[PDB]
Symmetry: C5
Amino acid sequence: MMEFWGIEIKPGKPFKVIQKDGFMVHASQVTLGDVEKVKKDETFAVYVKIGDDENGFMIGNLSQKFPQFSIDLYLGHEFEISHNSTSSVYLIGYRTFDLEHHH
Amino acid sequence: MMEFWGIEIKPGKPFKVIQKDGFMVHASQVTLGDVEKVKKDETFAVYVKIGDDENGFMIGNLSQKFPQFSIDLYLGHEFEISHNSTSSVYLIGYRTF
Amino acid sequence: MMEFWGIEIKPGKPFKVIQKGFMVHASQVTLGDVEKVKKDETFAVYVKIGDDENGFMIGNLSQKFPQFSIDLYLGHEFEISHNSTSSVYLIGYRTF
Amino acid sequence: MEFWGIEIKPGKPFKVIGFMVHASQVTLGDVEKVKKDETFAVYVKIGDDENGFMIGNLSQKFPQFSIDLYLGHEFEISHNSTSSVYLIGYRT
Amino acid sequence: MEFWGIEIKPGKPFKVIQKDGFMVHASQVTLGDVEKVKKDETFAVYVKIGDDENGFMIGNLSQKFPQFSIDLYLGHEFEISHNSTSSVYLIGYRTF
Protein backbone atom coordinates (compact mmCIF):
# COMPACT_ATOMS: atom_id res chain seq x y z
CA MET A 1 0.00 0.00 0.00
CA MET A 2 2.90 2.39 0.74
CA GLU A 3 6.43 2.59 -0.72
CA PHE A 4 9.23 4.79 0.61
CA TRP A 5 10.37 7.41 -1.90
CA GLY A 6 13.44 9.61 -1.56
CA ILE A 7 15.91 11.73 -3.50
CA GLU A 8 19.18 13.49 -2.79
CA ILE A 9 19.32 16.84 -4.57
CA LYS A 10 23.02 17.58 -4.99
CA PRO A 11 24.32 21.19 -4.90
CA GLY A 12 23.91 22.93 -8.27
CA LYS A 13 21.97 19.97 -9.73
CA PRO A 14 18.14 20.35 -9.85
CA PHE A 15 16.29 17.04 -9.68
CA LYS A 16 13.78 16.69 -12.52
CA VAL A 17 10.98 14.09 -12.54
CA ILE A 18 9.18 13.37 -15.84
CA GLN A 19 6.47 10.63 -15.65
CA LYS A 20 3.01 9.68 -17.07
CA ASP A 21 -0.22 11.28 -15.85
CA GLY A 22 -1.35 9.62 -12.64
CA PHE A 23 2.17 9.39 -11.16
CA MET A 24 2.25 11.11 -7.75
CA VAL A 25 4.55 11.27 -4.70
CA HIS A 26 3.73 12.53 -1.17
CA ALA A 27 6.76 14.56 -0.12
CA SER A 28 6.97 14.61 3.70
CA GLN A 29 10.35 15.88 4.79
CA VAL A 30 13.12 18.16 3.53
CA THR A 31 16.46 17.89 5.31
CA LEU A 32 19.73 19.85 5.01
CA GLY A 33 22.83 17.72 4.61
CA ASP A 34 26.21 18.44 6.22
CA VAL A 35 24.77 20.90 8.69
CA GLU A 36 28.18 21.29 10.40
CA LYS A 37 29.76 22.41 7.09
CA VAL A 38 27.36 25.03 5.72
CA LYS A 39 28.01 28.70 6.42
CA LYS A 40 26.79 29.41 9.93
CA ASP A 41 24.24 32.26 9.52
CA GLU A 42 22.99 31.60 5.99
CA THR A 43 19.50 30.61 4.90
CA PHE A 44 18.94 28.37 1.86
CA ALA A 45 15.77 28.21 -0.22
CA VAL A 46 14.17 25.08 -1.71
CA TYR A 47 12.06 25.52 -4.88
CA VAL A 48 9.65 23.41 -6.88
CA LYS A 49 8.89 24.02 -10.57
CA ILE A 50 5.84 22.30 -11.95
CA GLY A 51 5.42 21.02 -15.49
CA ASP A 52 6.94 23.43 -18.04
CA ASP A 53 6.80 26.51 -15.72
CA GLU A 54 9.90 28.67 -15.88
CA ASN A 55 9.36 29.98 -12.35
CA GLY A 56 9.20 27.99 -9.13
CA PHE A 57 7.50 28.21 -5.76
CA MET A 58 9.49 28.25 -2.59
CA ILE A 59 8.56 25.30 -0.43
CA GLY A 60 10.70 26.41 2.50
CA ASN A 61 13.97 27.60 3.97
CA LEU A 62 16.83 25.59 5.50
CA SER A 63 19.52 26.81 7.93
CA GLN A 64 21.60 25.62 10.88
CA LYS A 65 18.78 26.76 13.15
CA PHE A 66 15.99 25.09 11.09
CA PRO A 67 17.89 22.23 9.34
CA GLN A 68 14.80 20.28 8.28
CA PHE A 69 11.07 20.85 7.89
CA SER A 70 8.03 18.68 7.48
CA ILE A 71 5.53 19.31 4.72
CA ASP A 72 2.32 17.71 3.46
CA LEU A 73 2.85 18.03 -0.28
CA TYR A 74 1.72 16.00 -3.28
CA LEU A 75 3.92 16.21 -6.34
CA GLY A 76 2.59 15.09 -9.68
CA HIS A 77 3.86 13.66 -12.88
CA GLU A 78 6.22 16.50 -13.81
CA PHE A 79 8.31 18.57 -11.42
CA GLU A 80 11.78 19.81 -10.59
CA ILE A 81 13.27 20.39 -7.12
CA SER A 82 16.18 22.80 -6.70
CA HIS A 83 17.95 24.64 -3.90
CA ASN A 84 20.94 26.94 -3.34
CA SER A 85 22.75 25.06 -0.59
CA THR A 86 26.41 24.06 -0.88
CA SER A 87 25.37 20.76 0.75
CA SER A 88 22.95 18.10 -0.47
CA VAL A 89 19.25 18.38 0.42
CA TYR A 90 17.21 15.18 1.01
CA LEU A 91 13.53 15.14 0.08
CA ILE A 92 11.68 12.02 1.28
CA GLY A 93 8.12 10.70 1.53
CA TYR A 94 6.10 7.85 0.00
CA ARG A 95 3.94 6.68 -2.90
CA THR A 96 0.50 5.14 -2.12
CA PHE A 97 -0.98 2.14 -4.05
CA ASP A 98 -3.70 -0.50 -3.90
CA LEU A 99 -2.50 -4.02 -4.37
CA GLU A 100 -3.87 -7.48 -5.07
CA HIS A 101 -2.05 -10.80 -5.45
CA HIS A 102 -2.84 -13.97 -7.38
CA HIS A 103 -0.82 -16.76 -5.72
CA MET B 1 -4.84 15.51 -3.08
CA MET B 2 -3.30 15.19 -6.59
CA GLU B 3 -2.67 18.81 -7.74
CA PHE B 4 0.23 20.93 -6.46
CA TRP B 5 -1.00 24.40 -5.64
CA GLY B 6 0.90 27.50 -4.62
CA ILE B 7 0.56 31.27 -4.52
CA GLU B 8 2.99 34.08 -3.88
CA ILE B 9 1.36 36.84 -1.82
CA LYS B 10 3.24 40.03 -2.66
CA PRO B 11 3.80 42.78 -0.04
CA GLY B 12 0.75 45.05 0.26
CA LYS B 13 -1.31 42.89 -2.10
CA PRO B 14 -3.92 40.47 -0.69
CA PHE B 15 -4.37 37.40 -2.87
CA LYS B 16 -7.93 36.30 -3.66
CA VAL B 17 -8.54 32.67 -4.64
CA ILE B 18 -11.97 32.00 -6.15
CA GLN B 19 -13.00 28.33 -6.61
CA LYS B 20 -16.30 27.57 -8.40
CA ASP B 21 -15.58 23.90 -9.19
CA GLY B 22 -16.47 22.36 -5.78
CA PHE B 23 -12.84 21.44 -5.06
CA MET B 24 -10.74 22.95 -2.28
CA VAL B 25 -7.24 24.09 -1.47
CA HIS B 26 -5.36 22.23 1.25
CA ALA B 27 -2.87 24.76 2.54
CA SER B 28 0.16 22.93 3.91
CA GLN B 29 3.00 25.43 4.26
CA VAL B 30 3.48 29.18 4.76
CA THR B 31 6.98 30.49 4.02
CA LEU B 32 8.73 33.90 4.08
CA GLY B 33 10.07 34.50 0.58
CA ASP B 34 13.27 36.37 1.41
CA VAL B 35 14.35 36.22 5.01
CA GLU B 36 17.21 38.68 4.29
CA LYS B 37 14.72 41.34 3.09
CA VAL B 38 12.81 41.86 6.37
CA LYS B 39 13.41 43.94 9.48
CA LYS B 40 15.35 41.70 11.84
CA ASP B 41 13.16 41.68 15.00
CA GLU B 42 9.70 42.33 13.53
CA THR B 43 6.81 39.83 13.43
CA PHE B 44 4.36 39.74 10.55
CA ALA B 45 0.78 38.54 10.64
CA VAL B 46 -0.85 36.31 7.97
CA TYR B 47 -4.68 36.46 7.71
CA VAL B 48 -7.37 34.60 5.85
CA LYS B 49 -10.79 36.08 5.03
CA ILE B 50 -13.55 33.71 3.99
CA GLY B 51 -15.93 34.61 1.17
CA ASP B 52 -17.50 38.05 1.68
CA ASP B 53 -17.42 37.74 5.51
CA GLU B 54 -15.65 40.81 6.81
CA ASN B 55 -13.85 39.15 9.74
CA GLY B 56 -10.44 37.57 9.09
CA PHE B 57 -8.59 34.92 11.11
CA MET B 58 -4.88 34.70 11.66
CA ILE B 59 -3.27 31.61 10.18
CA GLY B 60 0.12 32.39 11.74
CA ASN B 61 3.01 34.79 12.15
CA LEU B 62 6.31 35.00 10.35
CA SER B 63 9.69 36.61 11.11
CA GLN B 64 13.36 36.28 10.13
CA LYS B 65 13.82 34.14 13.25
CA PHE B 66 10.76 31.91 12.60
CA PRO B 67 10.35 32.20 8.79
CA GLN B 68 7.91 29.36 8.03
CA PHE B 69 5.34 27.05 9.54
CA SER B 70 3.35 24.01 8.46
CA ILE B 71 -0.43 23.95 8.68
CA ASP B 72 -3.39 21.66 7.93
CA LEU B 73 -6.14 23.84 6.45
CA TYR B 74 -8.91 23.20 3.92
CA LEU B 75 -10.16 26.32 2.11
CA GLY B 76 -13.19 25.97 -0.15
CA HIS B 77 -14.94 28.50 -2.32
CA GLU B 78 -13.53 32.02 -2.07
CA PHE B 79 -10.79 33.09 0.30
CA GLU B 80 -8.27 35.87 0.58
CA ILE B 81 -4.78 35.68 2.06
CA SER B 82 -3.12 38.87 3.31
CA HIS B 83 -0.10 39.77 5.35
CA ASN B 84 1.90 42.82 6.45
CA SER B 85 5.40 41.69 5.54
CA THR B 86 7.81 43.64 3.35
CA SER B 87 8.76 40.30 1.77
CA SER B 88 6.58 37.97 -0.32
CA VAL B 89 4.89 35.07 1.49
CA TYR B 90 4.39 31.68 -0.27
CA LEU B 91 1.37 29.56 0.59
CA ILE B 92 1.79 26.05 -0.85
CA GLY B 93 -0.28 22.87 -0.71
CA TYR B 94 -2.54 20.97 -3.11
CA ARG B 95 -6.07 21.10 -4.52
CA THR B 96 -8.24 18.11 -3.56
CA PHE B 97 -11.88 16.92 -3.66
CA MET C 1 -11.89 18.74 5.39
CA MET C 2 -15.59 19.67 4.92
CA GLU C 3 -15.32 23.43 5.65
CA PHE C 4 -13.02 26.13 7.09
CA TRP C 5 -13.76 26.90 10.72
CA GLY C 6 -12.26 29.68 12.84
CA ILE C 7 -12.79 31.64 16.07
CA GLU C 8 -11.12 34.68 17.58
CA ILE C 9 -10.79 34.39 21.37
CA LYS C 10 -10.68 37.94 22.67
CA PRO C 11 -8.62 38.81 25.80
CA GLY C 12 -10.57 38.11 29.00
CA LYS C 13 -13.42 36.43 27.11
CA PRO C 14 -13.45 32.58 27.00
CA PHE C 15 -15.12 31.33 23.79
CA LYS C 16 -17.74 28.59 24.14
CA VAL C 17 -18.78 26.31 21.26
CA ILE C 18 -21.71 23.88 21.36
CA GLN C 19 -22.32 21.37 18.50
CA LYS C 20 -24.82 18.56 17.60
CA GLY C 21 -23.06 15.05 13.94
CA PHE C 22 -20.66 18.02 13.68
CA MET C 23 -16.96 17.77 14.61
CA VAL C 24 -14.46 20.65 14.74
CA HIS C 25 -10.86 19.76 13.85
CA ALA C 26 -8.63 22.41 15.38
CA SER C 27 -5.44 22.78 13.31
CA GLN C 28 -3.70 26.02 14.25
CA VAL C 29 -3.45 28.40 17.25
CA THR C 30 -1.97 31.84 16.59
CA LEU C 31 -1.08 34.79 18.84
CA GLY C 32 -2.55 38.13 17.74
CA ASP C 33 -0.78 41.50 17.84
CA VAL C 34 2.60 39.95 18.42
CA GLU C 35 4.30 43.38 18.29
CA LYS C 36 2.12 44.57 21.23
CA VAL C 37 2.45 41.76 23.78
CA LYS C 38 5.26 41.88 26.34
CA LYS C 39 8.39 40.34 24.82
CA ASP C 40 9.14 38.01 27.75
CA GLU C 41 5.67 36.60 28.54
CA THR C 42 4.39 33.09 27.78
CA PHE C 43 0.63 32.73 27.42
CA ALA C 44 -1.23 29.52 28.13
CA VAL C 45 -4.18 28.26 26.02
CA TYR C 46 -6.78 25.97 27.60
CA VAL C 47 -9.70 23.89 26.47
CA LYS C 48 -12.50 23.03 28.90
CA ILE C 49 -14.69 20.14 27.91
CA GLY C 50 -18.42 20.05 28.63
CA ASP C 51 -19.16 21.15 32.21
CA ASP C 52 -15.55 20.76 33.51
CA GLU C 53 -14.39 23.56 35.76
CA ASN C 54 -10.73 23.01 34.91
CA GLY C 55 -9.16 22.84 31.46
CA PHE C 56 -6.36 21.06 29.64
CA MET C 57 -3.57 23.05 28.13
CA ILE C 58 -3.46 22.82 24.37
CA GLY C 59 -0.25 24.85 24.14
CA ASN C 60 1.74 27.97 24.90
CA LEU C 61 2.22 31.16 22.89
CA SER C 62 4.87 33.88 23.05
CA GLN C 63 6.46 36.48 20.82
CA LYS C 64 9.27 33.98 20.18
CA PHE C 65 6.93 31.00 19.44
CA PRO C 66 3.76 32.85 18.27
CA GLN C 67 1.74 30.00 16.77
CA PHE C 68 1.58 26.22 16.90
CA SER C 69 -0.10 23.49 14.91
CA ILE C 70 -2.26 20.79 16.43
CA ASP C 71 -4.37 17.78 15.41
CA LEU C 72 -7.39 17.96 17.68
CA TYR C 73 -11.03 16.93 17.33
CA LEU C 74 -13.48 18.80 19.51
CA GLY C 75 -16.97 17.44 19.86
CA HIS C 76 -20.12 18.40 21.58
CA GLU C 77 -19.11 21.25 23.92
CA PHE C 78 -15.85 23.07 24.50
CA GLU C 79 -14.55 26.39 25.68
CA ILE C 80 -11.21 27.96 24.67
CA SER C 81 -9.48 30.42 27.01
CA HIS C 82 -6.11 32.04 27.34
CA ASN C 83 -4.33 34.75 29.37
CA SER C 84 -2.99 36.91 26.57
CA THR C 85 -3.58 40.66 26.39
CA SER C 86 -4.08 40.12 22.63
CA SER C 87 -6.57 37.94 20.75
CA VAL C 88 -5.81 34.28 20.00
CA TYR C 89 -7.07 32.71 16.73
CA LEU C 90 -7.99 29.05 16.67
CA ILE C 91 -8.65 27.74 13.16
CA GLY C 92 -9.26 24.42 11.44
CA TYR C 93 -12.20 22.75 9.70
CA ARG C 94 -15.62 21.29 10.53
CA THR C 95 -16.68 17.87 9.19
CA PHE C 96 -20.02 16.03 9.12
CA MET D 1 -14.32 10.31 17.86
CA GLU D 2 -14.09 12.14 21.18
CA PHE D 3 -11.68 14.49 22.92
CA TRP D 4 -9.30 12.72 25.28
CA GLY D 5 -6.89 14.35 27.73
CA ILE D 6 -4.78 13.76 30.84
CA GLU D 7 -2.77 15.97 33.15
CA ILE D 8 0.38 14.15 34.27
CA LYS D 9 1.31 15.65 37.62
CA PRO D 10 5.00 16.03 38.63
CA GLY D 11 6.44 12.80 40.06
CA LYS D 12 3.25 10.86 39.31
CA PRO D 13 3.28 8.59 36.23
CA PHE D 14 -0.19 8.36 34.71
CA LYS D 15 -1.41 4.83 33.94
CA VAL D 16 -4.15 4.30 31.36
CA ILE D 17 -6.12 1.07 30.91
CA GLY D 18 -10.66 -2.37 21.18
CA PHE D 19 -10.51 1.29 22.29
CA MET D 20 -7.58 3.43 21.19
CA VAL D 21 -6.14 6.82 22.07
CA HIS D 22 -4.62 9.06 19.40
CA ALA D 23 -2.14 11.27 21.26
CA SER D 24 -1.76 14.55 19.41
CA GLN D 25 -0.25 17.18 21.66
CA VAL D 26 2.09 17.37 24.66
CA THR D 27 2.28 20.68 26.54
CA LEU D 28 4.46 21.91 29.39
CA GLY D 29 2.63 23.60 32.26
CA ASP D 30 3.80 26.71 34.15
CA VAL D 31 6.38 27.47 31.51
CA GLU D 32 7.47 30.70 33.22
CA LYS D 33 8.15 28.86 36.50
CA VAL D 34 10.25 25.86 35.41
CA LYS D 35 14.04 26.00 35.42
CA LYS D 36 15.58 28.09 32.66
CA ASP D 37 17.44 26.19 29.96
CA GLU D 38 16.42 22.82 31.45
CA THR D 39 15.01 20.10 29.17
CA PHE D 40 12.41 17.66 30.44
CA ALA D 41 11.88 14.24 28.96
CA VAL D 42 8.48 12.60 28.41
CA TYR D 43 8.25 8.78 28.30
CA VAL D 44 5.69 6.17 27.43
CA LYS D 45 5.77 2.61 28.75
CA ILE D 46 3.59 0.13 26.91
CA GLY D 47 1.74 -2.69 28.71
CA ASP D 48 4.03 -4.33 31.27
CA ASP D 49 7.32 -3.09 29.70
CA GLU D 50 9.70 -1.78 32.33
CA ASN D 51 11.66 0.35 29.86
CA GLY D 52 9.96 3.14 27.95
CA PHE D 53 10.34 5.23 24.84
CA MET D 54 10.90 8.91 24.85
CA ILE D 55 8.08 10.66 23.05
CA GLY D 56 9.74 14.06 23.22
CA ASN D 57 11.42 16.78 25.16
CA LEU D 58 9.92 19.95 26.66
CA SER D 59 11.57 23.22 27.70
CA GLN D 60 10.86 26.94 27.95
CA LYS D 61 12.10 27.27 24.40
CA PHE D 62 10.06 24.30 23.05
CA PRO D 63 7.08 24.20 25.50
CA GLN D 64 4.82 21.94 23.45
CA PHE D 65 5.06 19.55 20.53
CA SER D 66 2.68 17.75 18.24
CA ILE D 67 2.80 14.02 17.68
CA ASP D 68 0.90 11.38 15.67
CA LEU D 69 0.73 8.44 18.05
CA TYR D 70 -1.80 5.65 18.59
CA LEU D 71 -1.78 4.11 22.07
CA GLY D 72 -3.65 0.88 22.76
CA HIS D 73 -5.05 -0.93 25.73
CA GLU D 74 -2.48 -0.15 28.41
CA PHE D 75 0.19 2.54 28.74
CA GLU D 76 1.88 4.81 31.23
CA ILE D 77 3.05 8.40 30.63
CA SER D 78 5.79 9.92 32.81
CA HIS D 79 8.04 12.93 32.76
CA ASN D 80 10.61 14.73 34.96
CA SER D 81 9.20 18.25 34.97
CA THR D 82 8.46 20.07 38.24
CA SER D 83 5.26 21.31 36.52
CA SER D 84 2.34 19.33 35.07
CA VAL D 85 2.41 18.04 31.49
CA TYR D 86 -0.85 17.85 29.48
CA LEU D 87 -1.19 15.07 26.90
CA ILE D 88 -4.31 15.43 24.71
CA GLY D 89 -5.77 13.89 21.61
CA TYR D 90 -8.89 11.85 20.80
CA ARG D 91 -10.25 8.34 21.45
CA THR D 92 -11.56 6.07 18.64
CA MET E 1 -3.08 -0.68 14.44
CA GLU E 2 -0.50 -0.64 17.23
CA PHE E 3 2.23 1.40 18.88
CA TRP E 4 5.67 0.88 17.44
CA GLY E 5 8.97 2.16 18.79
CA ILE E 6 12.71 1.51 18.72
CA GLU E 7 15.68 2.88 20.60
CA ILE E 8 18.72 3.28 18.37
CA LYS E 9 21.75 3.02 20.61
CA PRO E 10 24.94 5.01 19.90
CA GLY E 11 27.16 3.32 17.30
CA LYS E 12 24.59 0.60 16.63
CA PRO E 13 22.42 0.92 13.47
CA PHE E 14 19.05 -0.71 14.01
CA LYS E 15 17.82 -3.02 11.22
CA VAL E 16 14.07 -3.66 10.99
CA ILE E 17 12.70 -6.54 8.94
CA GLN E 18 8.93 -6.85 8.55
CA LYS E 19 6.60 -9.54 7.14
CA ASP E 20 4.62 -8.90 3.96
CA GLY E 21 1.71 -6.60 4.54
CA PHE E 22 3.16 -4.76 7.59
CA MET E 23 3.97 -1.05 7.43
CA VAL E 24 5.66 1.16 10.02
CA HIS E 25 4.56 4.79 10.17
CA ALA E 26 7.39 6.74 11.75
CA SER E 27 5.96 9.79 13.52
CA GLN E 28 8.61 11.15 15.84
CA VAL E 29 12.39 11.15 16.19
CA THR E 30 13.68 12.17 19.62
CA LEU E 31 17.21 12.75 20.98
CA GLY E 32 17.91 11.02 24.29
CA ASP E 33 19.93 12.45 27.18
CA VAL E 34 19.78 15.94 25.82
CA GLU E 35 21.68 17.36 28.82
CA LYS E 36 24.65 15.02 28.11
CA VAL E 37 25.34 15.54 24.40
CA LYS E 38 27.92 18.02 23.10
CA LYS E 39 26.36 21.46 23.41
CA ASP E 40 26.63 22.92 19.89
CA GLU E 41 26.84 19.73 17.80
CA THR E 42 24.26 18.53 15.24
CA PHE E 43 23.60 14.82 14.78
CA ALA E 44 22.36 13.29 11.57
CA VAL E 45 19.71 10.53 11.44
CA TYR E 46 19.65 8.24 8.38
CA VAL E 47 17.44 5.57 6.93
CA LYS E 48 18.81 2.95 4.55
CA ILE E 49 16.25 1.09 2.52
CA GLY E 50 16.53 -2.63 1.68
CA ASP E 51 20.11 -3.42 0.64
CA ASP E 52 21.18 0.23 -0.09
CA GLU E 53 24.63 1.04 1.20
CA ASN E 54 23.89 4.75 1.49
CA GLY E 55 21.11 6.31 3.54
CA PHE E 56 18.71 9.20 3.19
CA MET E 57 18.78 11.77 5.93
CA ILE E 58 15.47 11.90 7.76
CA GLY E 59 16.54 14.81 9.97
CA ASN E 60 19.01 16.44 12.29
CA LEU E 61 19.00 16.53 16.08
CA SER E 62 20.75 18.81 18.58
CA GLN E 63 20.33 20.07 22.14
CA LYS E 64 18.63 23.12 20.68
CA PHE E 65 16.33 21.13 18.33
CA PRO E 66 16.07 17.74 20.15
CA GLN E 67 13.16 16.14 18.29
CA PHE E 68 11.24 16.41 15.05
CA SER E 69 7.94 15.10 13.78
CA ILE E 70 7.75 13.22 10.50
CA ASP E 71 5.25 11.46 8.28
CA LEU E 72 7.09 8.44 6.87
CA TYR E 73 5.99 4.95 5.85
CA LEU E 74 8.66 2.25 6.00
CA GLY E 75 8.27 -1.24 4.59
CA HIS E 76 9.87 -4.63 4.44
CA GLU E 77 13.47 -3.75 5.31
CA PHE E 78 15.07 -0.59 6.64
CA GLU E 79 17.91 0.49 8.88
CA ILE E 80 18.03 3.55 11.14
CA SER E 81 21.38 5.03 12.13
CA HIS E 82 22.74 8.19 13.68
CA ASN E 83 25.99 9.66 15.03
CA SER E 84 24.85 10.80 18.48
CA THR E 85 26.60 9.82 21.69
CA SER E 86 23.10 9.34 23.16
CA SER E 87 20.26 7.05 22.11
CA VAL E 88 17.72 8.21 19.50
CA TYR E 89 14.05 7.09 19.72
CA LEU E 90 11.99 6.52 16.60
CA ILE E 91 8.30 5.98 17.38
CA GLY E 92 5.02 5.74 15.54
CA TYR E 93 2.64 2.87 14.74
CA ARG E 94 2.51 -0.37 12.76
CA THR E 95 -0.46 -1.39 10.55
CA PHE E 96 -1.48 -4.54 8.65
